[PDB]
Design an enzyme around this catalytic site. Structure first.
Site, PDB file in Angstrom:
ATOM      1  N   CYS A  64      60.266  31.454  72.561  1.00 35.15           N
ATOM      2  CA  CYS A  64      61.172  30.986  73.607  1.00 35.15           C
ATOM      3  C   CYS A  64      62.602  31.509  73.463  1.00 35.15           C
ATOM      4  O   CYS A  64      63.254  31.295  72.441  1.00 35.15           O
ATOM      5  CB  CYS A  64      61.189  29.457  73.668  1.00 35.15           C
ATOM      6  SG  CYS A  64      62.451  28.801  74.770  1.00 35.15           S
ATOM      7  N   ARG A  67      66.040  28.625  73.947  1.00 30.51           N
ATOM      8  CA  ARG A  67      66.142  27.531  72.983  1.00 30.51           C
ATOM      9  C   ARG A  67      67.547  26.978  72.733  1.00 30.51           C
ATOM     10  O   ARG A  67      67.695  25.992  72.012  1.00 30.51           O
ATOM     11  CB  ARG A  67      65.512  27.940  71.646  1.00 30.51           C
ATOM     12  CG  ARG A  67      63.996  27.901  71.626  1.00 30.51           C
ATOM     13  CD  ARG A  67      63.463  28.271  70.255  1.00 30.51           C
ATOM     14  NE  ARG A  67      63.431  29.714  70.042  1.00 30.51           N
ATOM     15  CZ  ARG A  67      63.295  30.288  68.852  1.00 30.51           C
ATOM     16  NH1 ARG A  67      63.194  29.539  67.763  1.00 30.51           N
ATOM     17  NH2 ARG A  67      63.273  31.610  68.750  1.00 30.51           N
ATOM     18  N   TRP A 236      63.651  26.025  83.316  1.00 33.07           N
ATOM     19  CA  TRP A 236      63.736  26.844  84.518  1.00 33.07           C
ATOM     20  C   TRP A 236      63.227  28.243  84.196  1.00 33.07           C
ATOM     21  O   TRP A 236      63.073  28.600  83.028  1.00 33.07           O
ATOM     22  CB  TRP A 236      65.165  26.893  85.064  1.00 33.07           C
ATOM     23  CG  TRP A 236      66.192  27.177  84.027  1.00 33.07           C
ATOM     24  CD1 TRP A 236      66.548  28.397  83.533  1.00 33.07           C
ATOM     25  CD2 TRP A 236      67.009  26.216  83.354  1.00 33.07           C
ATOM     26  NE1 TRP A 236      67.538  28.253  82.590  1.00 33.07           N
ATOM     27  CE2 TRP A 236      67.838  26.922  82.462  1.00 33.07           C
ATOM     28  CE3 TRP A 236      67.120  24.824  83.421  1.00 33.07           C
ATOM     29  CZ2 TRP A 236      68.765  26.283  81.642  1.00 33.07           C
ATOM     30  CZ3 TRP A 236      68.038  24.192  82.609  1.00 33.07           C
ATOM     31  CH2 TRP A 236      68.850  24.920  81.730  1.00 33.07           C
ATOM     32  N   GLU A 241      60.179  36.697  84.472  1.00 30.71           N
ATOM     33  CA  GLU A 241      58.857  36.080  84.433  1.00 30.71           C
ATOM     34  C   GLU A 241      58.164  36.214  85.782  1.00 30.71           C
ATOM     35  O   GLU A 241      56.947  36.379  85.855  1.00 30.71           O
ATOM     36  CB  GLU A 241      58.963  34.598  84.072  1.00 30.71           C
ATOM     37  CG  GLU A 241      59.580  34.306  82.723  1.00 30.71           C
ATOM     38  CD  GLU A 241      59.652  32.820  82.448  1.00 30.71           C
ATOM     39  OE1 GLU A 241      58.602  32.229  82.113  1.00 30.71           O
ATOM     40  OE2 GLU A 241      60.751  32.239  82.577  1.00 30.71           O
TER      41      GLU A 241
HETATM   42  C1  HEM Z   1      65.481  25.847  79.827  1.00 31.37           C
HETATM   43  C2  HEM Z   1      64.907  26.929  80.354  1.00 31.37           C
HETATM   44  C3  HEM Z   1      63.934  27.770  79.619  1.00 31.37           C
HETATM   45  C4  HEM Z   1      63.816  29.122  79.727  1.00 31.37           C
HETATM   46  C5  HEM Z   1      64.651  30.019  80.605  1.00 31.37           C
HETATM   47  C6  HEM Z   1      62.769  29.526  78.856  1.00 31.37           C
HETATM   48  C7  HEM Z   1      62.388  30.858  78.734  1.00 31.37           C
HETATM   49  C8  HEM Z   1      61.168  31.161  78.182  1.00 31.37           C
HETATM   50  C9  HEM Z   1      60.453  32.334  78.491  1.00 31.37           C
HETATM   51  C10 HEM Z   1      60.906  33.430  79.419  1.00 31.37           C
HETATM   52  C11 HEM Z   1      59.297  32.307  77.794  1.00 31.37           C
HETATM   53  C12 HEM Z   1      58.224  33.370  77.822  1.00 31.37           C
HETATM   54  C13 HEM Z   1      57.112  32.908  78.776  1.00 31.37           C
HETATM   55  C14 HEM Z   1      56.126  34.002  79.104  1.00 31.37           C
HETATM   56  O1  HEM Z   1      56.404  35.200  78.877  1.00 31.37           O
HETATM   57  O2  HEM Z   1      55.020  33.711  79.620  1.00 31.37           O
HETATM   58  C15 HEM Z   1      59.288  31.104  77.055  1.00 31.37           C
HETATM   59  C16 HEM Z   1      58.250  30.762  76.234  1.00 31.37           C
HETATM   60  C17 HEM Z   1      58.161  29.477  75.746  1.00 31.37           C
HETATM   61  N1  HEM Z   1      59.012  28.454  75.929  1.00 31.37           N
HETATM   62 FE1  HEM Z   1      60.665  28.453  76.822  1.00 31.37          FE
HETATM   63  N2  HEM Z   1      62.223  28.463  78.251  1.00 31.37           N
HETATM   64  C18 HEM Z   1      62.900  27.356  78.634  1.00 31.37           C
HETATM   65  C19 HEM Z   1      62.702  26.020  78.263  1.00 31.37           C
HETATM   66  C20 HEM Z   1      61.691  25.585  77.415  1.00 31.37           C
HETATM   67  C21 HEM Z   1      61.320  24.250  77.171  1.00 31.37           C
HETATM   68  C22 HEM Z   1      61.967  23.036  77.788  1.00 31.37           C
HETATM   69  C23 HEM Z   1      60.267  24.262  76.262  1.00 31.37           C
HETATM   70  C24 HEM Z   1      59.546  23.090  75.714  1.00 31.37           C
HETATM   71  C25 HEM Z   1      60.141  22.004  75.220  1.00 31.37           C
HETATM   72  C26 HEM Z   1      60.000  25.633  75.964  1.00 31.37           C
HETATM   73  C27 HEM Z   1      59.025  26.107  75.119  1.00 31.37           C
HETATM   74  C28 HEM Z   1      58.509  27.403  75.247  1.00 31.37           C
HETATM   75  C29 HEM Z   1      57.223  27.769  74.632  1.00 31.37           C
HETATM   76  C30 HEM Z   1      56.315  26.889  73.812  1.00 31.37           C
HETATM   77  C31 HEM Z   1      57.006  29.056  74.944  1.00 31.37           C
HETATM   78  C32 HEM Z   1      55.826  29.901  74.530  1.00 31.37           C
HETATM   79  C33 HEM Z   1      54.570  29.659  75.369  1.00 31.37           C
HETATM   80  C34 HEM Z   1      53.482  30.584  74.878  1.00 31.37           C
HETATM   81  O3  HEM Z   1      53.414  30.893  73.666  1.00 31.37           O
HETATM   82  O4  HEM Z   1      52.637  31.044  75.678  1.00 31.37           O
HETATM   83  N3  HEM Z   1      60.884  26.394  76.677  1.00 31.37           N
HETATM   84  N4  HEM Z   1      60.444  30.384  77.305  1.00 31.37           N
HETATM   85  N1  LIG Z   2      60.323  29.495  81.886  1.00 31.37           N
HETATM   86  C1  LIG Z   2      59.171  29.177  81.486  1.00 31.37           C
HETATM   87  N2  LIG Z   2      58.240  30.123  81.354  1.00 31.37           N
HETATM   88  C2  LIG Z   2      57.150  29.996  80.561  1.00 31.37           C
HETATM   89  C3  LIG Z   2      57.259  29.481  79.272  1.00 31.37           C
HETATM   90  C4  LIG Z   2      56.137  29.360  78.466  1.00 31.37           C
HETATM   91  C5  LIG Z   2      54.897  29.780  78.932  1.00 31.37           C
HETATM   92  C6  LIG Z   2      54.781  30.309  80.210  1.00 31.37           C
HETATM   93  C7  LIG Z   2      53.431  30.762  80.719  1.00 31.37           C
HETATM   94  O1  LIG Z   2      52.459  30.689  79.676  1.00 31.37           O
HETATM   95  C8  LIG Z   2      52.048  31.986  79.248  1.00 31.37           C
HETATM   96  C9  LIG Z   2      51.565  32.818  80.424  1.00 31.37           C
HETATM   97  C10 LIG Z   2      50.303  33.535  79.959  1.00 31.37           C
HETATM   98  N3  LIG Z   2      49.985  33.046  78.605  1.00 31.37           N
HETATM   99  C11 LIG Z   2      50.859  31.896  78.300  1.00 31.37           C
HETATM  100  C12 LIG Z   2      55.906  30.419  81.023  1.00 31.37           C
HETATM  101  C13 LIG Z   2      58.880  27.751  81.167  1.00 31.37           C
HETATM  102  C14 LIG Z   2      57.867  26.861  81.496  1.00 31.37           C
HETATM  103  C15 LIG Z   2      58.048  25.602  80.906  1.00 31.37           C
HETATM  104  C16 LIG Z   2      59.171  25.459  80.096  1.00 31.37           C
HETATM  105  S1  LIG Z   2      60.000  26.980  80.112  1.00 31.37           S
HETATM  106 CL   LIG Z   3      54.863  31.625  84.983  1.00 27.66          CL
END
Ligand code: HEM
Ligand SMILES: N/C(=N/c1cccc(CO[C@@H]2CCNC2)c1)c1cccs1
Ligand SMILES: [Cl-]
Ligand code: HEM
Ligand SMILES: N/C(=N/c1cccc(CO[C@@H]2CCNC2)c1)c1cccs1
Ligand SMILES: C[C@H](O)[C@H](O)[C@H]1CNc2nc(N)[nH]c(=O)c2N1
Ligand SMILES: C[C@H](O)[C@H](O)[C@H]1CNc2nc(N)[nH]c(=O)c2N1
Ligand SMILES: [Cl-]
Lengths: 361, 361
Positions: A64, A67, A236, A241
């Site tokens: 993420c 963070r 958001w 994405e």
């Molecule tokens: C506040 C705005 C946030 C932005 C802009 C953001 C941005 C991102 C992005 C761009 C990804 C990559 C997703 C993908 O490529 O599919 C990501 C992954 C992730 N984010 Fe965030 N995020 C945010 C908030 C959060 C929140 C609130 C959580 C949970 C408490 C979180 C937990 C995660 C997790 C667990 C992943 C990895 C999911 C996976 O492994 O497939 N994020 N984040």
């Molecule tokens: N911006 C985001 N984007 C994503 C963050 C984490 C995961 C994903 C989509 O999940 C992946 C897409 C394909 N494999 C897992 C999107 C968020 C969703 C919820 C909190 S932040």
């Molecule tokens: Cl998505």
């Protein structure tokens, strides 16, 4: 079994209470927990532990980039739910409060955890709001990433209108039940953003749109040995994405060739870099469209800057930083971010969010 | 010491002769080598082993996207050199034959290897053709990546004109000598490409240019226990190397803001994605400029396609594929390539090319 639970509990409470300034209350809380485990086979988090544990988990999410704002997470404690109507309304409420008229609140709703590895609530949705996908002899409609879940829903009596943007129903299964229930989403609760371009009027001919709030609902929250398998969370979108993956991938909406057409460039030669140019205009369109409508979004440059501050905040606080370089770099212009030019430790730190097996497929 | 050499020799000759269809000639060749090692402390490659070893090394370069044409490598055996005039003329010749009037031949020139870890020839250049860099109280000129080598050269009696594109001299040290010699490059041997844009005439106001042939001259070629520390090699550029890194990085030429100006867009807001747009036009300019002049170059999409064929060729040939995902993905639109969407084993296989410590710094 109650050994691994006890061990994770000791590590968590010590760290959590340390961060909360409650380091003295540790031994007596660890005392109660040890008894509660011995007598019951598990233990119950206080609201404070749960709230902070959910925040720590976000902080430890190596993949993420967003963070920086880990501590502002809005945590909803719904461990009290027992009925599918209660779950449905909880999910409905999450969507409403997180959306917040477009000014998105990063929110997580936490449902009862696994007991003996037995799920109380089992959510089938990847995200609470997502588009259906259909594949039938050469005819490809909607989001291919949703093909398997869509077929599963249609096995249960649901039927999609077969537009490219059918809202999937909420689908989850309660403990005891053999099948999941499904509930159609109230359109009034789902914000969508039509994609327009700031300079190019023909961009609307593509009739592209996306949903406002990404609410991940298939990951397990682990906090001190407790497995919250059902804990949907949202932030958001980062524009990339949507513009560089969801609408650009060949195995998704595959729109780059059509984007090139409406922006008036040939899609014939690799050396013209038409894919690169289409990616830029499409991603410009996405950011412009969300900001114009007043739905929260962040661009990848700003997000990387925020993440740099997160790195700085972490070292200043004496915490080790962990990250997945392969996921932190944006899918467009990654070398223009500081992320590309440094390395990250990909070690797993708990609390955290984890993948879990899909009930369907 | 002659144990590790013998071991690597056994592994190499067996594999090399296997690929060459000479599997029967192995035992007798391994026989001679074992004697040669016992008596001399090392062994001497045949022309065939050396040529193929250099090709295998390229094939095993995990970070190289251009490995499809590994077998067409032009190998020059210059193990016969003893004088600095011979080295200089070898380097001069490499530049000429590799350039080939713009139709670049992937070429490597191989100098005598280390004896007891003692270098026969010690090349100080990173690349045979590279621009100088100067930093003097707020005044930044040329290529900052060349700052340390430039200062080193100017310590030896060289003086740059302090343009942004001073050609560094060839600088290398012969065994026995305490200092390296330096030789100015004949301009007639160095092809340069002025950067122009196919559509935007004002792009020439930037007065950008780059050199035609990237000739890496500071890496060690290892072939069956033999350490060729001096073995400069070249291919052609992938456009992104120039447009997305060399001319785009803040710690390099840092030209994105100026590119945005000449293409007529504001460089004020992250959400405008002006860096992304500038990267695309600059990279379009680079490809257009090289192709217009008739100097070999490849775009990142075409290169990835070629690399996919390399992956296919490898599995078909029963060879394990190794790669560094973090280096194989292009710095622009990496998600538009298949590379982004799969993983690679980053295991080291010999023969290979390795980093080695800089004599300066
Ligand atoms: C506040 C705005 C946030 C932005 C802009 C953001 C941005 C991102 C992005 C761009 C990804 C990559 C997703 C993908 O490529 O599919 C990501 C992954 C992730 N984010 Fe965030 N995020 C945010 C908030 C959060 C929140 C609130 C959580 C949970 C408490 C979180 C937990 C995660 C997790 C667990 C992943 C990895 C999911 C996976 O492994 O497939 N994020 N984040
Ligand atoms: N911006 C985001 N984007 C994503 C963050 C984490 C995961 C994903 C989509 O999940 C992946 C897409 C394909 N494999 C897992 C999107 C968020 C969703 C919820 C909190 S932040
Ligand atoms: Cl998505
Ligand atoms: C034929 C055209 C070639 C192309 C287009 C090509 C492309 C590339 C590119 C883009 C890189 C990344 C460089 C960077 O980011 O700094 C690379 C790395 C590399 N290439 Fe190639 N390459 C080619 C030929 C060769 C040849 C002939 C060799 C040697 C026999 C070679 C060996 C390597 C090595 C060793 C690296 C990694 C250098 C390092 O780790 O710093 N390549 N290649
Ligand atoms: N296209 C090329 N690009 C490069 C390939 C390998 C290395 C480099 C530059 O070296 C890196 C730049 C900074 N650290 C090492 C550039 C080639 C040069 C010689 C054969 S192919
Ligand atoms: C930290 C990271 O490994 C580093 O910035 C790498 C990333 N991938 C790369 N890939 C290529 N081709 N060239 C580079 O210089 C780098 N830099
Ligand atoms: C193979 C590779 O790990 C995979 O394609 C990853 C690369 N990095 C990524 N990064 C993000 N943010 N999202 C992704 O889906 C991926 N895919
Ligand atoms: Cl280079």
């Amino acid at each position: 079994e109650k050994e691994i639970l006890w061990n994770e509990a000791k590590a968590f409470i010590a760290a959590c209470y340390q961060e909360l300034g409650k380091a003295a209350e540790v031994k007596d809380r660890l005392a109660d927990i040890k008894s509660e485990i011995d007598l019951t086979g598990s233990y119950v988090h206080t609201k404070e532990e749960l709230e902070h544990g959910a925040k720590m988990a976000w902080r430890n999410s190596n993949r993420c980039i967003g963070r920086l704002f880990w501590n502002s997470l809005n945590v909803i404690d719904r461990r009290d739910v027992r009925t599918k109507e209660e779950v449905r309304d909880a999910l409905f409420h999450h969507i409403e409060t997180a959306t917040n008229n477009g000014k998105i609140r990063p929110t997580i709703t936490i449902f009862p955890p696994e007991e003996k590895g037995e799920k109380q609530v089992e959510i089938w949705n990847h995200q609470l709001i997502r588009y259906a996908g259909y594949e039938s002899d050469g005819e490809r409609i909607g989001d291919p990433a949703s093909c398997s879940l869509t077929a599963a829903c249609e096995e249960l009596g649901w039927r999609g209108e077969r537009t490219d943007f059918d809202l999937l129903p909420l689908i989850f299964r309660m403990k005891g039940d053999e099948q999941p229930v499904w509930y159609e989403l109230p359109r009034s609760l789902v914000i969508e953003v039509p994609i327009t371009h700031p300079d190019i009027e023909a961009f609307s001919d593509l009739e592209l749109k996306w949903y406002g709030v990404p609410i991940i609902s298939d990951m397990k929250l682990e906090v001190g040995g407790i497995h919250y398998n059902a804990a949907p969370f949202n932030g958001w979108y980062m524009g990339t994405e949507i513009g560089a993956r969801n609408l650009a991938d060949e195995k998704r909406y595959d729109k780059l060739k059509k984007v090139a057409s409406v922006i008036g460039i040939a899609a014939d030669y690799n050396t013209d870099l038409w894919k690169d140019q289409a990616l830029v205009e499409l991603n410009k369109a996405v950011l412009h469209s969300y900001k114009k409508q007043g739905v929260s979004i962040v661009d990848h440059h700003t997000a990387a800057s925020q993440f740099k501050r997160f790195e700085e905040q972490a070292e200043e606080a004496g915490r080790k930083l962990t990250g997945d370089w392969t996921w932190l770099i944006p899918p467009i212009s990654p070398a223009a971010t500081h992320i590309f030019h440094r390395s990250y430790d990909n070690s797993i730190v708990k609390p955290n969010y984890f993948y879990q097996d899909k009930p369907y497929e």
